[PDB]
Design an enzyme around this catalytic site. Structure first.
Site, PDB file in Angstrom:
ATOM      1  CB  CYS A  85       2.018   7.252   3.744  1.00  0.00           C
ATOM      2  SG  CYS A  85       2.704   7.855   2.210  1.00  0.00           S
ATOM      3  NE  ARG A 104       3.480   9.230   6.964  1.00  0.00           N
ATOM      4  CZ  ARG A 104       3.190   9.004   8.230  1.00  0.00           C
ATOM      5  NH1 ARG A 104       2.685  10.011   8.983  1.00  0.00           N
ATOM      6  NH2 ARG A 104       3.418   7.755   8.858  1.00  0.00           N
ATOM      7  CD1 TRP A 154       8.464   7.088  -5.895  1.00  0.00           C
ATOM      8  CD2 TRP A 154       8.027   9.517  -6.278  1.00  0.00           C
ATOM      9  NE1 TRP A 154       9.305   8.077  -4.857  1.00  0.00           N
ATOM     10  CE2 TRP A 154       8.969   9.252  -5.212  1.00  0.00           C
ATOM     11  CE3 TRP A 154       7.705  10.502  -6.823  1.00  0.00           C
ATOM     12  CZ2 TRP A 154       9.748  10.405  -4.606  1.00  0.00           C
ATOM     13  CZ3 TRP A 154       8.260  11.919  -6.189  1.00  0.00           C
ATOM     14  CH2 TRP A 154       8.952  11.781  -5.154  1.00  0.00           C
ATOM     15  CD  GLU A 201       3.277   1.085  -3.298  1.00  0.00           C
ATOM     16  OE1 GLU A 201       2.063   1.242  -3.313  1.00  0.00           O
ATOM     17  OE2 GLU A 201       4.171   1.851  -3.626  1.00  0.00           O
TER      18      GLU A 201
HETATM   19  C1  HEM Z   1       5.659  10.084  -3.481  1.00  0.00           C
HETATM   20  C2  HEM Z   1       5.981   8.759  -3.424  1.00  0.00           C
HETATM   21  C3  HEM Z   1       5.300   7.899  -2.302  1.00  0.00           C
HETATM   22  C4  HEM Z   1       5.311   6.942  -1.783  1.00  0.00           C
HETATM   23  C5  HEM Z   1       6.484   6.074  -2.381  1.00  0.00           C
HETATM   24  C6  HEM Z   1       4.332   6.251  -1.211  1.00  0.00           C
HETATM   25  C7  HEM Z   1       4.491   5.126  -0.425  1.00  0.00           C
HETATM   26  C8  HEM Z   1       3.268   4.444   0.222  1.00  0.00           C
HETATM   27  C9  HEM Z   1       3.008   2.925   0.407  1.00  0.00           C
HETATM   28  C10 HEM Z   1       4.179   1.693   0.044  1.00  0.00           C
HETATM   29  C11 HEM Z   1       1.770   2.961   1.133  1.00  0.00           C
HETATM   30  C12 HEM Z   1       1.091   1.425   1.202  1.00  0.00           C
HETATM   31  C13 HEM Z   1       0.054   1.180   0.528  1.00  0.00           C
HETATM   32  C14 HEM Z   1      -0.044  -0.186   0.233  1.00  0.00           C
HETATM   33  O1  HEM Z   1       0.595  -1.182   0.560  1.00  0.00           O
HETATM   34  O2  HEM Z   1      -1.013  -0.527  -0.789  1.00  0.00           O
HETATM   35  C15 HEM Z   1       1.263   4.224   1.073  1.00  0.00           C
HETATM   36  C16 HEM Z   1      -0.146   4.448   1.537  1.00  0.00           C
HETATM   37  C17 HEM Z   1      -0.600   5.777   1.588  1.00  0.00           C
HETATM   38  N1  HEM Z   1      -0.081   6.838   1.054  1.00  0.00           N
HETATM   39 FE1  HEM Z   1       1.821   7.148   0.082  1.00  0.00          FE
HETATM   40  N2  HEM Z   1       3.449   7.199  -1.011  1.00  0.00           N
HETATM   41  C18 HEM Z   1       3.560   8.232  -1.933  1.00  0.00           C
HETATM   42  C19 HEM Z   1       2.871   9.364  -2.008  1.00  0.00           C
HETATM   43  C20 HEM Z   1       1.810   9.682  -1.479  1.00  0.00           C
HETATM   44  C21 HEM Z   1       1.020  10.888  -1.846  1.00  0.00           C
HETATM   45  C22 HEM Z   1       1.528  12.137  -2.629  1.00  0.00           C
HETATM   46  C23 HEM Z   1      -0.006  10.830  -0.902  1.00  0.00           C
HETATM   47  C24 HEM Z   1      -1.038  11.738  -0.488  1.00  0.00           C
HETATM   48  C25 HEM Z   1      -0.861  13.407  -1.069  1.00  0.00           C
HETATM   49  C26 HEM Z   1      -0.052   9.621  -0.248  1.00  0.00           C
HETATM   50  C27 HEM Z   1      -0.986   9.401   0.695  1.00  0.00           C
HETATM   51  C28 HEM Z   1      -1.292   7.838   1.067  1.00  0.00           C
HETATM   52  C29 HEM Z   1      -2.047   7.352   1.905  1.00  0.00           C
HETATM   53  C30 HEM Z   1      -3.439   8.136   2.383  1.00  0.00           C
HETATM   54  C31 HEM Z   1      -1.790   6.224   2.125  1.00  0.00           C
HETATM   55  C32 HEM Z   1      -2.784   5.189   3.065  1.00  0.00           C
HETATM   56  C33 HEM Z   1      -3.336   4.277   2.022  1.00  0.00           C
HETATM   57  C34 HEM Z   1      -4.336   3.417   2.845  1.00  0.00           C
HETATM   58  O3  HEM Z   1      -4.469   3.607   4.103  1.00  0.00           O
HETATM   59  O4  HEM Z   1      -4.668   2.162   2.195  1.00  0.00           O
HETATM   60  N3  HEM Z   1       1.035   8.859  -0.655  1.00  0.00           N
HETATM   61  N4  HEM Z   1       2.035   5.061   0.580  1.00  0.00           N
HETATM   62  C1  LIG Z   2      -0.112   7.773  -3.664  1.00  0.00           C
HETATM   63  C2  LIG Z   2       0.586   6.333  -3.502  1.00  0.00           C
HETATM   64  C3  LIG Z   2       2.031   6.121  -3.772  1.00  0.00           C
HETATM   65  C4  LIG Z   2       2.241   4.907  -3.703  1.00  0.00           C
HETATM   66  N1  LIG Z   2       3.739   4.384  -3.933  1.00  0.00           N
HETATM   67  N2  LIG Z   2       1.623   3.933  -3.056  1.00  0.00           N
HETATM   68  C5  LIG Z   2       0.124   4.320  -2.876  1.00  0.00           C
HETATM   69  C6  LIG Z   2      -0.595   3.165  -1.939  1.00  0.00           C
HETATM   70  C7  LIG Z   2      -1.660   2.341  -2.865  1.00  0.00           C
HETATM   71  C8  LIG Z   2      -2.964   2.363  -2.290  1.00  0.00           C
HETATM   72  C9  LIG Z   2      -3.632   0.933  -2.000  1.00  0.00           C
HETATM   73  C10 LIG Z   2      -4.705   0.710  -1.389  1.00  0.00           C
HETATM   74  C11 LIG Z   2      -5.400  -0.465  -1.268  1.00  0.00           C
HETATM   75  C12 LIG Z   2      -5.642  -0.668   0.094  1.00  0.00           C
HETATM   76  C13 LIG Z   2      -6.874  -1.615   0.540  1.00  0.00           C
HETATM   77  C14 LIG Z   2      -8.009  -0.615   1.004  1.00  0.00           C
HETATM   78  C15 LIG Z   2      -8.934  -0.734  -0.003  1.00  0.00           C
HETATM   79  N3  LIG Z   2      -7.893  -1.499  -0.792  1.00  0.00           N
HETATM   80  C16 LIG Z   2      -8.555  -2.871  -0.915  1.00  0.00           C
HETATM   81  C17 LIG Z   2      -5.316   1.856  -0.660  1.00  0.00           C
HETATM   82  C18 LIG Z   2      -4.782   2.962  -0.840  1.00  0.00           C
HETATM   83  F1  LIG Z   2      -5.300   3.945   0.040  1.00  0.00           F
HETATM   84  C19 LIG Z   2      -3.715   3.469  -1.480  1.00  0.00           C
HETATM   85  F2  LIG Z   2      -3.051   4.615  -1.452  1.00  0.00           F
HETATM   86  C20 LIG Z   2      -0.159   5.566  -3.104  1.00  0.00           C
HETATM   87 CL   LIG Z   3      -0.988  -0.617  -6.492  1.00  0.00          CL
END
Ligand code: HEM
Ligand SMILES: Cc1cc(N)nc(CCc2cc(CC[C@H]3CCN3C)cc(F)c2F)c1
Ligand SMILES: [Cl-]
Ligand code: HEM
Ligand SMILES: Cc1cc(N)nc(CCc2cc(CC[C@H]3CCN3C)cc(F)c2F)c1
Ligand SMILES: C[C@H](O)[C@H](O)[C@H]1CNc2nc(N)[nH]c(=O)c2N1
Ligand SMILES: C[C@H](O)[C@H](O)[C@H]1CNc2nc(N)[nH]c(=O)c2N1
Ligand SMILES: [Cl-]
Ligand SMILES: [Gd]
Ligand SMILES: [Gd]
Ligand SMILES: [Zn+2]
EC number: 1.14.13.39
Lengths: 402, 401
Positions: A106, A109, A278, A283
């Site tokens: 993420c 964070r 958001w 993305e």
């Molecule tokens: C507030 C604005 C946030 C932004 C701008 C953001 C941004 C991102 C981005 C760009 C990714 C990459 C995922 C992808 O490429 O598909 C990601 C992954 C992730 N985010 Fe954030 N995020 C935000 C909020 C949060 C929140 C609120 C949570 C949980 C409380 C969170 C938990 C995660 C987790 C667990 C992943 C891992 C996803 C995975 O392993 O596939 N995020 N985030």
């Molecule tokens: C809260 C939030 C905010 C923003 N901006 N972006 C995101 C990421 C979207 C997001 C996308 C995926 C797809 C990944 C692969 C694994 C299963 N899938 C095929 C898996 C996530 F776990 C996740 F979180 C989350």
């Molecule tokens: Cl998405």
């Protein structure tokens, strides 16, 4: 014995001491690195719970206090009497924030301490679950001024099935397998789309049809719920200077709300705990719209732009992708819907790394996910070496319930 | 056997070649260090035995007369002298293998076409310079670039090493300031001050080609001015932005890495410079746009009249695409070999498919294979990769000073 980490833009060197505390094991060995792969008993419950309680009482400056030891004995006794234990409300809030803080993939964070935690652990049915989800969507969307939130449904427990949200996100567009084998709509969502139809959903035939929710209560078949259209805020995509772009009829939704991950706190597992923040513009513009296995619009946009798509060296793909990302940023800003560009987001992530080095001696980060999918070396995180490891509390992947 | 998936197509392969990984890497189950640039006497016979086995497998002659014969010879050479000599063909085979095994190299589809110059009889710094000069002229070839490596004498106990002190054969000067800043290339401020220290009259330009610091065993280095007509350079122009040429940007034709250590069959070659041709993003994105390099991005954006006051205008992305266009246009107009990152990654995908059937996998370092711009627009982005060390190999080594 602690990894030395360099930033190549400034010359900085830090040591990641936090990684030595890594509580579970990843896919890599001294033989081979698998960092690029997308998918990498009372005693062991108690030791997990004990570590989390220690974390919680450290965060409130009550380490080794009367209340700390009391809580350890309470959990010990509840695991002996029931095989599990219940988190206090404050412990749940703390655990959910730490899970976000600990998420290596993420880039958002910097925000981890600003998370609204809704306690739905008293939820009783799929119908109540739906109402909790609608209010999460309403709160988080906030008419375009998005707010980070998580709703926690009841934990896994002996004697009962799980609560599960079958959708990977709360808002998703249908993917209709068409009879050539092509997909109309989002190819990422072909499976859940078929499941929705199989459970009685009357499909559409558009490219941006919002899917219903499939919600599963313990020991019950999933139940279909249509989202009220006025809760799903969407943004039509236009470009500030390419006026034909609006005629593509492209749209995306405001709220990224992941609904299929497992939240783990102190050995307890919450298989339903959707969270939202958001979007980062890449993305939407780069991955969702330009991935060849998603909407795959890149060549259509390049042709419209009059680029020379017969030769790679004209960099037509790069030029078209930049203007798609410009269109996303412009459209969300015009609609007054929170969005962050990849330059601001990676700058803020660098501040997070500095904050976390002071606070905890390091920060788990997955370089390949932190570096944006376009303009990688134009962002500061490209030049920052990172250490990837697993800390708990954590968001974890889990198998699809079907 | 790790399972590896391509997410664009949905196909699955298994990297069985990883099971034979040698000198272990920096990662543990506790923590991955895949993003770090630098990963955190009878053993000679084990490495020679394995390499000779590699050699005779590749020519379909394992377990044959010439194979057994060669095994005993290296045994007798090491027993008598403590080291051994590679046959000319084995040196050729090992050089191509070390390139083929290079996990960070996206250009490996070319690994079969490598010209090896055998310089193991070299004996002075003046000899080196003639060898390096022959390599540069062959590899440059009036702009029709040809991959090449020159292998100087191997390391041996008791004596000093042949070393090239420059990181590349062509580098631009980096001149420190009355105030910290740098005229020229900041990556080469250290070696610029060494050349000046050993008698080199510096210049005043942003693109002065440094002299060479060549070190024969146990002798201090010596400066060698590179012949100006041997250094092919490309003035940078843009196909439509007429003012781009006025920025006075240039780069050189030949990427020739002169500081890595070549390890073959337990033998070490600390002087073995190799060259190929550039991928355009190396010049346009890294060398010209990195903040700690020439850092030209904002100056190009001002000329393009872009709004540098808000990151969300994507002015960095726009300026960077036009720099990369100018690089490709300039090298093609100069008739100097160059490959764009789309073509290079598509060929690397073909290389992975070839290596799958030939060897059961391919060591690949995802963070270095994916280009530094337009990552997810290339197929390698969506390809899961396994990183590990095989020998023969190119290894990093300490700076000789
Ligand atoms: C507030 C604005 C946030 C932004 C701008 C953001 C941004 C991102 C981005 C760009 C990714 C990459 C995922 C992808 O490429 O598909 C990601 C992954 C992730 N985010 Fe954030 N995020 C935000 C909020 C949060 C929140 C609120 C949570 C949980 C409380 C969170 C938990 C995660 C987790 C667990 C992943 C891992 C996803 C995975 O392993 O596939 N995020 N985030
Ligand atoms: C809260 C939030 C905010 C923003 N901006 N972006 C995101 C990421 C979207 C997001 C996308 C995926 C797809 C990944 C692969 C694994 C299963 N899938 C095929 C898996 C996530 F776990 C996740 F979180 C989350
Ligand atoms: Cl998405
Ligand atoms: C012929 C065309 C070639 C192309 C297009 C190419 C491309 C590249 C690129 C883009 C990198 C990334 C390294 C960086 O950015 O720092 C790289 C690394 C590397 N290349 Fe190639 N290369 C070519 C030829 C060769 C040859 C002929 C050799 C050796 C015989 C070689 C050996 C290596 C090695 C060892 C690395 C690792 C660099 C490092 O780890 O720092 N390459 N190559
Ligand atoms: C033959 C060839 C052709 C093409 N096109 N590109 C290359 C890559 C250039 C190249 C660049 C570097 C700098 C990397 C970091 C690690 C130490 N330094 C600060 C280190 C190499 F080892 C290398 F090889 C080689
Ligand atoms: C195969 C490769 O690991 C895969 O495409 C990864 C790479 N990096 C990523 N980074 C982000 N932020 N999101 C992703 O989906 C991916 N996908
Ligand atoms: C910190 C990070 O690992 C480092 O900047 C790496 C990333 N990937 C790279 N990839 C290439 N091709 N060249 C590089 O110098 C780097 N640098
Ligand atoms: Cl270079
Ligand atoms: Gd227009
Ligand atoms: Gd002007
Ligand atoms: Zn690793």
């Amino acid at each position: 014995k602690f990894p030395r980490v360099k930033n190549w833009e400034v010359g900085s060197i830090t040591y990641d001491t936090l990684s030595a505390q890594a509580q579970q094991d990843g896919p890599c060995t001294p033989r081979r690195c698998l960092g690029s792969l997308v998918f990498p008993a009372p005693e062991q419950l108690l030791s997990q719970a004990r570590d989390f309680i220690n974390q919680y009482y450290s965060s409130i400056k009550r380490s080794g206090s009367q209340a700390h030891e009391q809580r350890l004995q309470e959990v010990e006794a509840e695991v002996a009497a029931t095989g599990t234990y219940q988190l206090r409300e404050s412990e749940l809030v703390f655990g959910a924030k730490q899970a976000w803080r600990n998420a290596p993939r993420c880039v958002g964070r910097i925000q981890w301490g600003k998370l609204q935690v809704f306690d739905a652990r008293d939820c009783r049915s799929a119908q109540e679950m739906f109402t909790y989800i609608c209010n999460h969507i309403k709160y988080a969307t906030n008419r375009g001024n998005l707010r980070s939130a998580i709703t926690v449904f009841p934990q896994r427990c002996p004697g009962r099935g799980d609560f599960r949200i079958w959708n990977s996100q709360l808002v998703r567009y249908a993917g209709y397998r068409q009879q050539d084998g092509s997909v109309r709509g989002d190819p990422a969502n072909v499976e859940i789309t078929e499941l929705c139809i199989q459970h009685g959903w009357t499909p559409g035939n558009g490219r941006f049809d919002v899917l219903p929710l499939l919600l599963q209560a313990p020991d019950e078949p999933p139940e279909l719920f249509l989202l009220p259209p006025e809760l799903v805020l969407e943004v039509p995509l236009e470009h500030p200077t390419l006026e034909w772009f609006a005629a593509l009829g492209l749209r995306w939704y405001a709220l990224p709300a992941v609904s299929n991950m497992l939240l783990e706190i102190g050995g307890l597992e919450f298989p339903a705990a959707p969270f939202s923040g958001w979007y980062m513009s890449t993305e939407i513009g780069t991955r969702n719209l330009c991935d060849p296995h998603r909407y795959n619009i890149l060549e259509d946009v390049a042709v419209c732009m009059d680029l020379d798509t017969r030769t790679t060296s004209s960099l037509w793909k790069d030029k078209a992708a930049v203007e798609i990302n410009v269109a996303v940023l412009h459209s969300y800003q015009l609609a007054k819907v929170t969005i962050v560009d990849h330059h601001a987001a990676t700058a803020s992530f660098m501040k997070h790394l500095e904050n976390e080095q002071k606070a905890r001696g390091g920060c788990p980060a997955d370089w390949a996910w932190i570096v944006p999918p376009i303009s990688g070396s134009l962002t500061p995180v490209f030049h920052q070496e990172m250490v990837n490891y697993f800390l708990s509390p954590a968001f974890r992947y889990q198998p699809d319930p079907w």
